[PDB]
Amino acid sequence: HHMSYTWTGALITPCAAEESKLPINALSNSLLRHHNMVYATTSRSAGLRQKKVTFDRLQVLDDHYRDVLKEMKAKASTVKAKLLSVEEACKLTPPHSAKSKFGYGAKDVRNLSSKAVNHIHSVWKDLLEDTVTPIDTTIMAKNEVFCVQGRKPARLIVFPDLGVRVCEKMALYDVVSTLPQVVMGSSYGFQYSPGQRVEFLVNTWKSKKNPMGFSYDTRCFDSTVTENDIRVEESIYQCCDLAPEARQAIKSLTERLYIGGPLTNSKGQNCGYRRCRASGVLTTSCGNTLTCYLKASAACRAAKLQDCTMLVNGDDLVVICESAGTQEDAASLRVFTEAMTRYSAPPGDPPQPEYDLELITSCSSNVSVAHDASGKRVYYLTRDPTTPLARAAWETARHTPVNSWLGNIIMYAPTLWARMILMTHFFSILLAQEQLEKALDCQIYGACYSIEPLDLPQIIERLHGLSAFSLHSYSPGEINRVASCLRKLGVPPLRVWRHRARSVRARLLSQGGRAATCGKYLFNWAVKTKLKLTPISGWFVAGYSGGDIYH
C-alpha cells in the first residue's frame, strides 16, 4: 500500500462552534430569498471527506516524464533565490494567522516580539540540525459557503505551527515566488491578472490554425501527490542557486513536513498520518503547479497532441492545441488521461474536447465577450455567479475573516453580475454604515490583502482598464446564465438592481472625494446618459494558497 492517509479514529474537531445554516438579518432578503439553498461546510461532515481523500496511489514513471523533468530542471538551474531575514518573513505573516502553541501570536510575529523571534530562531536552528523528525501538523475542517447542487463535505486543511510557517517563508518565499515563471514561462497561470489571462487564452486560441482546448480536472489533486512527487519537487528547488543554509532548510522541510507527518486535531489528539500534499504549507501552490505541469506536459507527449500550449494554476489545468480532427482529438484525450492516470493524477470528470473558447472553464472561469463604449468587441473573464452570490449572502449578515464579495468585485469587475449586484449591494451596506473608508481583508491567488473599498475604482482601472466601467451588450449566453442563477437563488432581477444602483450612485456623489469617484466610475452603467470617464502592486506574481501570506 501507498495510502494517502492513515487514520486512528479520533475525530477532526472544531475550535469555535460552527454554523451550517445561512444567518439572516434585515439586509438578507434584499439580496436573496431562498435561504435554504445556501449552507456552510462544518466538521460534522469531516468523516465523508476522509473517505474521499483516502486511497492507494500507484505511479508508473516513463521516459516522457523524465524528459520533461530534466528540461524543467535545466530552467530551474537559472534561478537565484535568497534567504529572507526573520524580519522580512515576520512582515509577510497575516495579522490574524493562527497563533503558535509556543506562547506568542501573529501580532507578536509582525511586531518582532523577542519571544516570537527567539522561538523562530530556535525552529530554524532545529531545521539545520535535524532532517528526519516529522514535524507536527494540525488538521481542521474548513467552513466554506456553497449553494446546494445536495451538499459537499468540508475540505480538510493541514498546517504546521506559526514558528514553522515563518521558517518556511525564510527558506522558500523567494524560490516559490520566482521559480514557477522561470520553469514554465507563459504557462504559469498566477503571473496574469484576469485581463492578461483572457489575452493569453484568446491569443493562444488564435495562434492555432484549428483550435481545440480542454480543461483537465484531477480528482482530489492533493491526495494524488506522492512522496515521489514531493521529492521531485524538492530536486527542482535544489537546482536553484541557493545559499548552503537554504539548501539544508529546504531538505529538512521536505523530509520532515512536505512529504508527510502526523495529524493532530484542535484538541491535541492524534488523528493519523499524512503521506500526500498538505493543503496549508507555503509550497502547496508552487508544488502543485510544478507537479501538475510535469505530469500534464509528459501526458501531452504520450498523446501526441500537436502544438499544445498549457495553462497551469496549481491543480487547475487547461490545454489548447492544434486539432487533428474531431475523432482524432477525442482519442488523443483518452490517451492523455491514461497517461495522467499512470502518473497518479486520475480525472475527476473525463476531459472533453471543446471547439468554442467560451465553453472552456478553468480556474472556475470562462472567457466571454461584451462591447466597450466605442462598440468594439471586448473579451473578459466571467464565471457562474452562484457561489459568489451564496457567499455574499453569508457576508451580508456575518463578518467573516475573508470578504469574498470584495475579491470578487476586484477580479470580476467587468462582469454583468459583479457590477449590477455585488457593487450595488455592498456599496449600499457600506454607505449606510459609513464604512467606505474601512480596510477589509480579501484573498487573491491565496494571498491576503487589506483593501479599502473606496480604492476600488483605481484598483479596477489598474487591473482591467477603463473599459471595465463601460462594458455593455453582454452575450445572450452570459445574460441568460446570470438571470437563471438569480431565479435559482431568489435574487431580485437585474432590472431591480439598476434602480437600486441609481440610488447608490446618487448617494455616493452626495459625498465628494473618493466616494464620488466610486459613484462616478463604478455606477456609470446605471445612468441613461453616461459621463466621460477618464483616467484617475506585485499582485499577480505568484500563487500562495494555504501559504499564510499577507501582502
211 binds ligand B5P (CB under 6 A): no
Nearest residue (beta carbon) to ligand B5P:
314
Instruction: Provide DSSP, 442-477.
Output: EEETTEEEEE-GGGHHHHHHHHH-GGGGT-B---HH
Cα distances (Å, whole numbers) of residue 286 to 2, 53, 73, 174, 225 = 23, 21, 14, 11, 13
Which residue is listed with cell 457593487?
423
Q: Which residues of 263-299 are buried (b: 16+ CB within 10 A; e: fewer)?
A: bbbeeeeebbbbbbbbbbbbbbbbbbbbbbbbbbbbb
CB of 421 to ligand B5P, least distance (A): 16
**Cell of residue 248, nine digits:** 539544508
* 197 scored as a contact of ligand B5P (CB under 6 A): yes
Counting residues that bind ligand B5P (by CB under 6 A) gives: 22
The reply on whether position 381 binds ligand B5P by CB under 6 A is: yes
Looking at the Cβ atoms of 69 and 363, the one nearer to ligand B5P is 363
Distance of alpha carbon 507 from alpha carbon 81, whole angstroms: 50
Shortest separation between residue 36's beta carbon and ligand B5P, angstroms? 26
Q: Does 521 bind ligand B5P (CB under 6 A)?
A: no
**How, if at all, do strands 261-264 and 137-141 pair?**
parallel
If binding is defined by CB under 6 A, does position 194 make contact with ligand B5P?
Answer: yes
Nearest distance from residue 546's CB to ligand B5P, in Å?
7
5 or 449, CB closer to ligand B5P?
449
Q: Which amino acid is at 106?
A: A
Nearest approach, Cβ of 61 to ligand B5P (angstroms)?
Answer: 21
543 touching ligand B5P, by CB under 6 A: yes
Q: Does 316 bind ligand B5P (CB under 6 A)?
A: yes
Q: Which one-letter amino acid corresponds to residue 238?
A: Q
Whole-angstrom CA distances from 321 to 69, 174, 230, 246, 285 are 21, 32, 29, 39, 25
Tell which one of 105, 211, 260, 407 touches ligand B5P (CB under 6 A). 407
According to the binding rule CB under 6 A, does residue 389 interact with ligand B5P? no
> Distance between CA 514 and CA 49 in Å, rounded?
46
Contacting range for ligand B5P; rule: CB under 6 A; set: 206-214, 224-232, 348-356, 361-369? 361-369
Residue 349 or 434 with smaller CB distance to ligand B5P: 349
- Asked if 291 contacts 224 with a C-beta cutoff of 8 angstroms, the reply is no
- Closest approach, Cβ 256 to ligand B5P, in A, equals 21
Residue 187 makes contact with ligand B5P by CB under 6 A? no
Task: Give yes or no for a contact between 423 and 524, defined as CB atoms under 8 angstroms apart.
Answer: no
Whose Cβ is closer to ligand B5P: residue 127's or residue 440's?
440
Among 92, 154, 545, 549, binds ligand B5P (CB under 6 A): 545
Please, which residue, 83 or 141, has the CB nearer to ligand B5P?
141
Cα separation, 302 vs 311, whole angstroms: 18
Angle between helices 494-509 and 476-489 (to 10 degrees): 90
Question: 431 to 450, contacts with ligand B5P by CB under 6 A?
Answer: 443-446
Q: Which stretch binds ligand B5P (CB under 6 A): 53-61, 224-232, 335-343, 357-365?
A: 357-365
Q: Does 415 interact with ligand B5P (rule: CB under 6 A)?
A: no
Distance CA 191, CA 543 (A): 8
Q: Please choose, from the candidates 210, 215, 217, 216, the residue with its C-alpha nearest in 3D space to the C-alpha of residue 306.
A: 210
Is 372 flagged in the annotation as binding?
Answer: no
161 a known binding residue?
Answer: no
Is 180 a binding residue for ligand B5P by CB under 6 A? The answer is: no
- Is position 453 an interface residue for ligand B5P (rule: CB under 6 A)? no
**Contact indicator for 292, 314 with CB cutoff of 8 Å:** yes
Cβ within 8 Å of residue 153, ≥6 positions away:
41, 45, 46, 47, 48, 49, 52
| By the rule CB under 6 A, 282 interacts with ligand B5P | no
Asked whether position 542 contacts ligand B5P by CB under 6 A, the answer is no
For residue 364, state whether it binds ligand B5P (rule: CB under 6 A): yes
Nearer to ligand B5P, 197 or 500 (CB): 197
Answer yes or no whether residue 315 interacts with ligand B5P by CB under 6 A: yes
Please state the closest distance from residue 387 (CB atom) to ligand B5P, in A: 10
Q: Is 414 in the site for ligand B5P (CB under 6 A)?
A: no
Minimum distance between the CB of residue 380 and ligand B5P, rounded to whole angstroms? 10
Q: Does 411 bind ligand B5P (CB under 6 A)?
A: yes
CB of 289 to ligand B5P, least distance (A): 7
Half-sphere exposure of 461 (CA within 13 A, CB side): 13
Strand partners of residue 444: 447
* Residue closer to ligand B5P, measured from CB, 211 or 547: 547
Any binding-site annotation on 217?
Answer: yes
How many Å separate Cα 236 from the centre of its chain? 23
Which of 143, 226, 285, 341 is the binder for ligand B5P (CB under 6 A)? 285
Distance between first and last Cα of the chain: 41
Answer yes or no: are the C-beta atoms of 456 and 439 closer than 8 Å.
no
Shortest approach of ligand B5P to residue 485 CB, angstroms? Answer: 17
Contact (Cβ atoms closer than 8 angstroms) between residue 442 and residue 403:
yes
Q: Which is nearer to ligand B5P, 363 or 420 (CB)?
A: 363
C-alpha grid cell, residue 350: 473525463
- Binding piece for ligand B5P, criterion CB under 6 A, among 31-39, 83-91, 281-289, 523-531: 281-289
By CB under 6 A, name the one of 313, 332, 387, 467 that touches ligand B5P.
313
d(CA 487, CA 73): 51
Q: How many C-alpha atoms does 416 have within 13 Å on its Cβ side?
A: 24
Residue the block writes with cell 501570536:
105
How far from the centroid of its chain's Cα atoms is residue 263's Cα?
A: 24
Chain residues in the site for ligand B5P (CB under 6 A): 194, 197, 284-285, 288, 313-316, 363-365, 381, 407-408, 411, 443-446, 543, 545
Which amino acids are annotated as binding site for Mg(2+), given as ranges? Answer: 217, 315-316
